[PDB]
Design an enzyme around this catalytic site. Structure first.
Site, PDB file in Angstrom:
ATOM      1  N   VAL A  23       0.851  -1.186   0.000  1.00 46.19           N
ATOM      2  CA  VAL A  23       0.000   0.000   0.000  1.00 46.19           C
ATOM      3  C   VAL A  23       0.886   1.234   0.000  1.00 46.19           C
ATOM      4  N   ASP A  46      17.781  16.884  -9.547  1.00 48.18           N
ATOM      5  CA  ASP A  46      17.262  17.485  -8.326  1.00 48.18           C
ATOM      6  C   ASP A  46      18.177  18.598  -7.817  1.00 48.18           C
ATOM      7  N   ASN A 125      21.617  30.159  17.505  1.00 44.08           N
ATOM      8  CA  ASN A 125      21.464  29.020  18.402  1.00 44.08           C
ATOM      9  C   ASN A 125      20.022  28.797  18.837  1.00 44.08           C
ATOM     10  N   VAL A 149      15.925  17.059  11.931  1.00 39.69           N
ATOM     11  CA  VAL A 149      15.629  17.827  13.137  1.00 39.69           C
ATOM     12  C   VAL A 149      15.120  19.220  12.784  1.00 39.69           C
ATOM     13  N   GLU A 303      -0.378 -10.801 -24.369  1.00 40.51           N
ATOM     14  CA  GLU A 303      -1.129 -10.405 -25.563  1.00 40.51           C
ATOM     15  C   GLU A 303      -0.200  -9.906 -26.662  1.00 40.51           C
ATOM     16  N   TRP A 325      -9.389 -11.745 -24.281  1.00 40.40           N
ATOM     17  CA  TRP A 325     -10.195 -12.057 -25.459  1.00 40.40           C
ATOM     18  C   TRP A 325     -11.248 -13.143 -25.218  1.00 40.40           C
ATOM     19  N   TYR A 351      -5.394  -8.886 -35.152  1.00 34.90           N
ATOM     20  CA  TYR A 351      -4.083  -8.230 -35.056  1.00 34.90           C
ATOM     21  C   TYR A 351      -2.905  -9.109 -35.467  1.00 34.90           C
ATOM     22  N   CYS A 411      -9.508  -1.937 -32.760  1.00 32.02           N
ATOM     23  CA  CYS A 411      -9.571  -0.557 -32.295  1.00 32.02           C
ATOM     24  C   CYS A 411      -8.283   0.204 -32.588  1.00 32.02           C
ATOM     25  N   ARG A 431      -9.305   4.150 -33.154  1.00 26.73           N
ATOM     26  CA  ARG A 431     -10.609   4.576 -33.663  1.00 26.73           C
ATOM     27  C   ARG A 431     -11.652   4.652 -32.557  1.00 26.73           C
ATOM     28  N   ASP A 434     -12.211   3.408 -24.971  1.00 24.28           N
ATOM     29  CA  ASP A 434     -12.890   3.274 -23.690  1.00 24.28           C
ATOM     30  C   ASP A 434     -11.957   3.890 -22.653  1.00 24.28           C
ATOM     31  N   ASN A 442      -4.065   0.339 -23.113  1.00 26.48           N
ATOM     32  CA  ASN A 442      -3.581   0.541 -24.474  1.00 26.48           C
ATOM     33  C   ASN A 442      -2.347   1.442 -24.490  1.00 26.48           C
ATOM     34  N   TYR A 474     -17.995   5.451 -20.547  1.00 28.38           N
ATOM     35  CA  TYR A 474     -19.257   4.774 -20.267  1.00 28.38           C
ATOM     36  C   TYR A 474     -19.894   5.361 -19.017  1.00 28.38           C
TER      37      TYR A 474
HETATM   38  N1  NDP Z   1      17.519  14.810   1.282  1.00 30.33           N
HETATM   39  C1  NDP Z   1      17.273  16.028   1.909  1.00 30.33           C
HETATM   40  O1  NDP Z   1      16.370  16.744   1.462  1.00 30.33           O
HETATM   41  C2  NDP Z   1      18.108  16.398   3.097  1.00 30.33           C
HETATM   42  C3  NDP Z   1      18.902  15.423   3.654  1.00 30.33           C
HETATM   43  N2  NDP Z   1      19.681  15.693   4.774  1.00 30.33           N
HETATM   44  C4  NDP Z   1      20.288  14.591   5.516  1.00 30.33           C
HETATM   45  O2  NDP Z   1      19.707  14.616   6.808  1.00 30.33           O
HETATM   46  C5  NDP Z   1      20.727  14.238   7.798  1.00 30.33           C
HETATM   47  C6  NDP Z   1      20.998  15.405   8.726  1.00 30.33           C
HETATM   48  O3  NDP Z   1      19.788  15.779   9.245  1.00 30.33           O
HETATM   49  P1  NDP Z   1      19.764  15.600  11.015  1.00 30.33           P
HETATM   50  O4  NDP Z   1      20.570  14.395  11.292  1.00 30.33           O
HETATM   51  O5  NDP Z   1      18.270  15.616  11.256  1.00 30.33           O
HETATM   52  O6  NDP Z   1      20.616  16.822  11.661  1.00 30.33           O
HETATM   53  P2  NDP Z   1      20.157  18.336  11.147  1.00 30.33           P
HETATM   54  O7  NDP Z   1      20.783  18.639   9.815  1.00 30.33           O
HETATM   55  O8  NDP Z   1      18.671  18.354  11.312  1.00 30.33           O
HETATM   56  O9  NDP Z   1      20.863  19.384  12.192  1.00 30.33           O
HETATM   57  C7  NDP Z   1      20.905  18.775  13.465  1.00 30.33           C
HETATM   58  C8  NDP Z   1      21.664  19.796  14.356  1.00 30.33           C
HETATM   59  O10 NDP Z   1      21.283  21.136  14.027  1.00 30.33           O
HETATM   60  C9  NDP Z   1      21.385  21.914  15.255  1.00 30.33           C
HETATM   61  N3  NDP Z   1      20.057  22.440  15.620  1.00 30.33           N
HETATM   62  C10 NDP Z   1      18.790  21.992  15.199  1.00 30.33           C
HETATM   63  N4  NDP Z   1      17.776  22.705  15.703  1.00 30.33           N
HETATM   64  C11 NDP Z   1      18.405  23.671  16.489  1.00 30.33           C
HETATM   65  C12 NDP Z   1      17.899  24.733  17.289  1.00 30.33           C
HETATM   66  N5  NDP Z   1      16.549  24.984  17.418  1.00 30.33           N
HETATM   67  N6  NDP Z   1      18.736  25.554  17.956  1.00 30.33           N
HETATM   68  C13 NDP Z   1      20.078  25.267  17.815  1.00 30.33           C
HETATM   69  N7  NDP Z   1      20.710  24.318  17.123  1.00 30.33           N
HETATM   70  C14 NDP Z   1      19.834  23.511  16.445  1.00 30.33           C
HETATM   71  C15 NDP Z   1      22.031  20.991  16.320  1.00 30.33           C
HETATM   72  O11 NDP Z   1      23.318  21.094  16.065  1.00 30.33           O
HETATM   73  P3  NDP Z   1      24.342  20.924  17.498  1.00 30.33           P
HETATM   74  O12 NDP Z   1      24.222  19.438  17.616  1.00 30.33           O
HETATM   75  O13 NDP Z   1      25.663  21.505  16.990  1.00 30.33           O
HETATM   76  O14 NDP Z   1      23.507  21.770  18.414  1.00 30.33           O
HETATM   77  C16 NDP Z   1      21.433  19.641  15.878  1.00 30.33           C
HETATM   78  O15 NDP Z   1      22.196  18.598  16.427  1.00 30.33           O
HETATM   79  C17 NDP Z   1      21.983  13.917   7.010  1.00 30.33           C
HETATM   80  O16 NDP Z   1      21.890  12.585   6.659  1.00 30.33           O
HETATM   81  C18 NDP Z   1      21.808  14.814   5.777  1.00 30.33           C
HETATM   82  O17 NDP Z   1      22.535  14.361   4.676  1.00 30.33           O
HETATM   83  C19 NDP Z   1      19.817  17.005   5.225  1.00 30.33           C
HETATM   84  C20 NDP Z   1      19.076  17.998   4.721  1.00 30.33           C
HETATM   85  C21 NDP Z   1      18.058  17.786   3.653  1.00 30.33           C
HETATM   86  C1  U8Y Z   2      19.436  16.076  -2.314  1.00 29.08           C
HETATM   87  C2  U8Y Z   2      19.743  17.548  -2.324  1.00 29.08           C
HETATM   88  C3  U8Y Z   2      18.549  18.324  -1.836  1.00 29.08           C
HETATM   89  N1  U8Y Z   2      17.540  18.496  -2.710  1.00 29.08           N
HETATM   90  C4  U8Y Z   2      16.466  19.190  -2.276  1.00 29.08           C
HETATM   91  N2  U8Y Z   2      15.454  19.372  -3.151  1.00 29.08           N
HETATM   92  N3  U8Y Z   2      16.307  19.722  -1.050  1.00 29.08           N
HETATM   93  C5  U8Y Z   2      17.312  19.540  -0.171  1.00 29.08           C
HETATM   94  N4  U8Y Z   2      17.142  20.080   1.048  1.00 29.08           N
HETATM   95  C6  U8Y Z   2      18.484  18.841  -0.544  1.00 29.08           C
HETATM   96  C7  U8Y Z   2      19.645  18.555   0.386  1.00 29.08           C
HETATM   97  C8  U8Y Z   2      20.660  19.663   0.537  1.00 29.08           C
HETATM   98  C9  U8Y Z   2      20.550  20.574   1.587  1.00 29.08           C
HETATM   99  C10 U8Y Z   2      21.467  21.590   1.723  1.00 29.08           C
HETATM  100  C11 U8Y Z   2      22.490  21.718   0.803  1.00 29.08           C
HETATM  101  C12 U8Y Z   2      22.687  20.784  -0.209  1.00 29.08           C
HETATM  102  C13 U8Y Z   2      23.795  20.965  -1.188  1.00 29.08           C
HETATM  103  C14 U8Y Z   2      24.671  19.927  -1.500  1.00 29.08           C
HETATM  104  C15 U8Y Z   2      25.693  20.107  -2.419  1.00 29.08           C
HETATM  105  C16 U8Y Z   2      25.804  21.300  -3.107  1.00 29.08           C
HETATM  106  C17 U8Y Z   2      24.897  22.322  -2.876  1.00 29.08           C
HETATM  107  C18 U8Y Z   2      24.986  23.629  -3.634  1.00 29.08           C
HETATM  108  O1  U8Y Z   2      24.070  24.482  -3.441  1.00 29.08           O
HETATM  109  O2  U8Y Z   2      25.951  23.801  -4.436  1.00 29.08           O
HETATM  110  C19 U8Y Z   2      23.899  22.144  -1.921  1.00 29.08           C
HETATM  111  C20 U8Y Z   2      21.724  19.784  -0.360  1.00 29.08           C
HETATM  112  O1  UMP Z   3      -8.107  -2.257 -27.127  1.00 28.73           O
HETATM  113  C1  UMP Z   3      -9.246  -1.834 -26.929  1.00 28.73           C
HETATM  114  C2  UMP Z   3     -10.348  -2.584 -27.326  1.00 28.73           C
HETATM  115  C3  UMP Z   3     -11.623  -2.100 -27.093  1.00 28.73           C
HETATM  116  N1  UMP Z   3     -11.787  -0.885 -26.487  1.00 28.73           N
HETATM  117  C4  UMP Z   3     -13.190  -0.480 -26.261  1.00 28.73           C
HETATM  118  C5  UMP Z   3     -13.647   0.758 -27.019  1.00 28.73           C
HETATM  119  C6  UMP Z   3     -15.127   0.458 -27.162  1.00 28.73           C
HETATM  120  O2  UMP Z   3     -15.752   0.861 -25.967  1.00 28.73           O
HETATM  121  C7  UMP Z   3     -15.192  -1.057 -27.300  1.00 28.73           C
HETATM  122  C8  UMP Z   3     -15.134  -1.498 -28.766  1.00 28.73           C
HETATM  123  O3  UMP Z   3     -16.327  -1.071 -29.391  1.00 28.73           O
HETATM  124  P1  UMP Z   3     -16.517  -0.755 -30.958  1.00 28.73           P
HETATM  125  O4  UMP Z   3     -15.935   0.584 -31.292  1.00 28.73           O
HETATM  126  O5  UMP Z   3     -15.896  -1.824 -31.839  1.00 28.73           O
HETATM  127  O6  UMP Z   3     -18.000  -0.659 -31.202  1.00 28.73           O
HETATM  128  O7  UMP Z   3     -14.061  -1.555 -26.617  1.00 28.73           O
HETATM  129  C9  UMP Z   3     -10.684  -0.124 -26.086  1.00 28.73           C
HETATM  130  O8  UMP Z   3     -10.769   0.985 -25.524  1.00 28.73           O
HETATM  131  N2  UMP Z   3      -9.422  -0.614 -26.326  1.00 28.73           N
END
Ligand code: NDP
Ligand code: U8Y
Ligand code: UMP
Ligand code: NDP
Ligand code: U8Y
Ligand code: UMP
Lengths: 526, 528
Positions: A23, A46, A125, A149, A303, A325, A351, A411, A431, A434, A442, A474
């Site tokens: 799921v 990305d 901080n 975090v 098919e 069929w 076909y 079709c 032609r 559905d 298709n 339909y």
């Molecule tokens: N794919 C993506 O989009 C992204 C992926 N990542 C991945 O996620 C992981 C890192 O994320 P995570 O591990 O969650 O750590 P974070 O990058 O979330 O930063 C964690 C640290 O940030 C500081 N911090 C956070 N909140 C506060 C606050 N309110 N005040 C002060 N300091 C704060 C603390 O640093 P200190 O411990 O020094 O206080 C905390 O330990 C890595 O694997 C990274 O590669 C990261 C960003 C985006």
């Molecule tokens: C998987 C990446 C990603 N994609 C999207 N859409 N959101 C994100 N939060 C990140 C992760 C991320 C966060 C901060 C800096 C970098 C990064 C890495 C290397 C170079 C640079 C740069 O700016 O040159 C930035 C990546």
């Molecule tokens: O590959 C197929 C075969 C049939 N149909 C549907 C379209 C029509 O609803 C019906 C065929 O009807 P006629 O056009 O032949 O009357 O089956 C498709 O969408 N794709």
């Protein structure tokens, strides 16, 4: 009165993969990182997206932002964005990219202070100090970059106005995860085209927090038809940008529901119908297996292989428990076609027989038709190889002479192929369509056929193009399609073929793999 | 300027008057003997009331601001528009319409007394009194309604910001005319859809004096959308200078532009080279016009004879050649057939092409003189019967791509098939074309199958609805590029009309004399 995240334009941007007949839901995409780094090697598309969003500014819009922020703060009268990173996030970025170019860098930390950093960065901080900082800075927008975090506490505090969310449609080992988005707090408002990058598909979705103008009016001076209701498409109509290629299919359904013509049909169910559509799918970027409901492909692949063998024996499919069929092969159905001298499940010159034996006289499903008729499947493979600019590369199943001998007329009227730059595109003209039941399958059938022809001609697949003639819904499907149109597509899967198959006749069911199919729940169209 | 300060516009409707050269001045008939030259054309009347009553109050604050500063004032001391009518024009308006509803009525008249009309109705006696009157009113915009005198003086005084010009595509006797619009002074910027009202086509052209939370999201989704084909879009100055291009001919023109801008360079058999793309749809509304291209001249006699020859089931090319219809000549030469390996085919015997497949699909072809009566499938008869007897059928198709006979054909058909669709007494037709010469072939092909759709619909007692053209391999020959550059920068005229002899009730009974194109207005011919 006002929200902090609206005055200061605080967004979050992230990229999430999948983590280890299941799921699926939005929380399927939640893998952020692993062992302090990213779960995947560089997905470069990305990165390009991430850099465009976090660096883009519009100067002409700042004065209003500037005015608004003054008013909130109760103050009077190149531009860059601010980006906020956790400390762990910051340390995982390669040094050559720090500080992030053309952005104002901000790091959250307690264990480190500004003395611990060589770079041009702000240290704060606590979250409250970011708001203070933003009130003192000139900037366009503020993007929260994680990590986990940082995301959790900015979501916790209702400080995020939009989530720019990349869905990485592949599975990796992870140890940190994006928070579960509360669907009551955030809704999807936009979904991008699907792309392939570094051997994975992905899209980009956006969660939101829950003079010449008059000439236009003049030219529209001349503008509840089908008993279909607004609130029955709330989700579908709330989306702002619908760029996912699955919307080519869903929009056509919408169009037939809102503007279709009521008509009877051969079956007596009655339909809404329109005439003439075109969809285009980029097979270089995705395999367009619909995701807003569950689809299975073993039958339609058997098919297709059964077609390519030139078979017309319905027992061959039934023995593989493929019943596509079956209803077309019964004594009753054949008799009502006036095929009184036709054995049960002998579908006549349909076909398969037309692709390998066009113009041959059909006898029965057991005959050996070798070297009878035009083997047009072989002919079009030869034209693609040896005459790629030909405008005559066509494969036709509508044999006018044989129509009445067929269990029913085809079709899928024809396929035309196009070669440019080592890449193969295919148009298939249907032609009769559905939309609720047949068209999903298709699209998949001819998309696979395009891959097979491209591979055995040593080309790469490009576009599958689908022209619908009589396109109908339909009335028996309307309530199910209302459900389906209010689902948001997932990134498409990919199709892989055994690369050692060099001739069109040599494929077997096991040479096909569909990977990373993510999909909504199955739907009975009735 | 005055007209930009006070937003002074002209709105008019012009018919044609009694090898002809056409131009914008072709449409200039305003009135005749104190009335309109035509019986009422209700669609222009609806557009007229819409333009002259429409007001955007949210936009008035800046117009008021602009007018006041011009006058060195701070105040002007329900928003309607102002309408200016000459006295001749004013008196020839039916009584039950005056004063024009929801409009501030203003009348230039050197002989009318301010008395005989209410205080809400104004009477000036020279042009600068209107500028004075506009300085003292709240109004959205000011429309000059005619007549000819009022147009002429307002125009030679450079007091007109835009012209909303209805083109009535029929001819009438007239005694008053719009002034010739100097194209150095004004230029067309927008062109509407083509319409049918009261037995005439018409279109509407505009002359001109010569949540952003989701705006940014648009930019992000374009992040990967990084002109490729040595074409300089400044060569399409007129084409790209238009704002609204709603004329159905732009369906064709936009596709040439797309192939030029984005087409793939490929070669072809003649070494000429093409720009090609794959997969387009065009839709033309036959209920409202006949889509005969107007941005160059097109002839239709040969086109119609070829169709009639098709319906007769003929494959003998000499029949066409003796009528001087030379569409197929090059395909019937000894050399062309020999290259096709048709060594045993008489010159101009084209083999089992369109006509043979429409009337005899599956019959064994012998030669072009043989008797094929009751041999093979008569598709044309079959689909006409399906249209009449099973109109909701989804199998009403007419197919020329007989895979078995392709090699015996002088060449395989470009027009693969027609499919038909019937709803509420109306006939639409899809044609699928595998190969599309955009510069030369496609304009003729749209006309051929638009006519054919009319013929099928009439012998089935249906009205024609849409003709729908699906382009497969769509190409522009490299040697057409200069000619199509000229063509993209011409503005289309409202389309002509097709008339069939209404007595013909059988597909086989049409003759060349049963077809008439009405009111074909076009630009000059182009050698491609
Ligand atoms: N794919 C993506 O989009 C992204 C992926 N990542 C991945 O996620 C992981 C890192 O994320 P995570 O591990 O969650 O750590 P974070 O990058 O979330 O930063 C964690 C640290 O940030 C500081 N911090 C956070 N909140 C506060 C606050 N309110 N005040 C002060 N300091 C704060 C603390 O640093 P200190 O411990 O020094 O206080 C905390 O330990 C890595 O694997 C990274 O590669 C990261 C960003 C985006
Ligand atoms: C998987 C990446 C990603 N994609 C999207 N859409 N959101 C994100 N939060 C990140 C992760 C991320 C966060 C901060 C800096 C970098 C990064 C890495 C290397 C170079 C640079 C740069 O700016 O040159 C930035 C990546
Ligand atoms: O590959 C197929 C075969 C049939 N149909 C549907 C379209 C029509 O609803 C019906 C065929 O009807 P006629 O056009 O032949 O009357 O089956 C498709 O969408 N794709
Ligand atoms: N289809 C269309 O686009 C339109 C068609 N029409 C047709 O146009 C025809 C009218 O042509 P026309 O006779 O030229 O109509 P006009 O309204 O142009 O007649 C002009 C009148 O306006 C007054 N006038 C003109 N210039 C001045 C001025 N500088 N200062 C003061 N008063 C001035 C005079 O009234 P006085 O005699 O008191 O001096 C003069 O008789 C009619 O047949 C009408 O049906 C009408 C409107 C537009
Ligand atoms: C041929 C029409 C036309 N179309 C366009 N596009 N420009 C025009 N200058 C006119 C002519 C015209 C001028 C002034 C008033 C009336 C009028 C008649 C009857 C009723 C009303 C009304 O407003 O009810 C107005 C017509
Ligand atoms: O009715 C026609 C006949 C021909 N062509 C053009 C398309 C191609 O340029 C050429 C067809 O030659 P091949 O596609 O067979 O190569 O003729 C048309 O556009 N319309």
């Amino acid at each position: 009165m006002e929200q902090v995240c609206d005055v200061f334009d605080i967004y979050a941007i992230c990229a999430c993969c999948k983590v280890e007949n299941e799921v699926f839901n939005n929380y399927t995409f939640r893998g952020l990182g692993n062992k302090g780094v990213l779960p995947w090697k560089c997905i470069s598309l990305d990165m390009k997206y991430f850099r465009a969003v976090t660096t883009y500014v519009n100067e002409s819009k700042y004065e209003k932002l500037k005015y608004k922020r003054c008013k909130y703060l109760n103050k009077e009268t190149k531009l860059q964005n601010v980006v906020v990173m956790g400390r762990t996030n910051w340390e995982s970025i390669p040094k050559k990219f720090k500080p992030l170019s053309n952005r104002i860098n901000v790091i959250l930390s307690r264990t480190l202070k500004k003395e611990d950093f060589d770079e041009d960065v702000y240290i704060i901080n606590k979250v409250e100090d970011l708001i203070v900082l933003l009130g003192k800075l000139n900037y366009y927008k503020c993007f929260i970059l994680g990590g986990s975090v940082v995301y959790q506490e900015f979501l916790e505090k209702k400080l995020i106005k939009k989530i720019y969310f990349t869905r990485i449609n592949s599975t990796y080992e992870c140890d940190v995860f994006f928070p579960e988005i509360n669907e009551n707090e955030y809704q999807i408002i936009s979904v991008s085209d699907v792309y392939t990058s570094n051997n994975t598909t992905l899209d980009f979705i956006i969660y939101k927090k829950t003079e010449e103008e008059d000439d236009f009016v003049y030219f529209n001076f001349n503008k509840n038809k089908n008993s279909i209701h607004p609130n029955d498409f709330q989700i579908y109509n709330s989306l702002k940008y619908k760029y996912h290629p699955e919307y080519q299919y869903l929009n056509i359904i919408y169009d037939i529901m809102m503007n279709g013509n009521k008509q009877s049909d051969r079956t007596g169910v009655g339909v809404l119908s329109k005439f003439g559509y075109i969809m285009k799918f980029d097979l270089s970027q995705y395999f367009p297996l619909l995701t807003t409901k569950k689809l299975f492909l073993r039958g339609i692949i058997e098919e297709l292989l059964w077609f390519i063998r030139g078979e017309t024996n319905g027992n061959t499919l039934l023995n593989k428990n493929v019943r596509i069929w079956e209803a077309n092969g019964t004594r009753e159905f054949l008799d009502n076609r006036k095929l009184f001298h036709r054995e049960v499940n002998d579908l006549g010159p349909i076909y398969g027989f037309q692709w390998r034996h066009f113009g041959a006289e059909y006898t029965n499903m057991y005959d050996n038709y070798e070297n009878k008729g035009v083997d047009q499947l072989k002919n079009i493979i030869n034209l693609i190889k040896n005459d790629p600019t030909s405008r005559r590369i066509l494969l036709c199943a509508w044999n006018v002479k044989d129509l009445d001998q067929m269990a029913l007329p085809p079709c899928h009227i024809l396929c035309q192929f196009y070669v440019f730059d080592g890449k193969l595109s295919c148009i298939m003209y249907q032609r009769s369509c559905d939309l609720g039941l047949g068209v999903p399958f298709n699209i998949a059938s001819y998309s696979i056929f395009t891959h097979m022809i491209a591979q055995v001609c040593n080309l790469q697949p490009a576009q599958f193009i689908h022209v619908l003639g009589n396109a109908h819904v339909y009335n028996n499907h309307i309530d199910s399609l209302k459900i389906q149109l209010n689902r948001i597509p997932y990134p498409f899967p990919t199709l892989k073929l055994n690369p050692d198959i060099k001739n069109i006749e040599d494929f077997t069911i096991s040479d096909f793999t569909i990977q990373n199919y993510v999909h909504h729940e199955k739907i009975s169209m009735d």
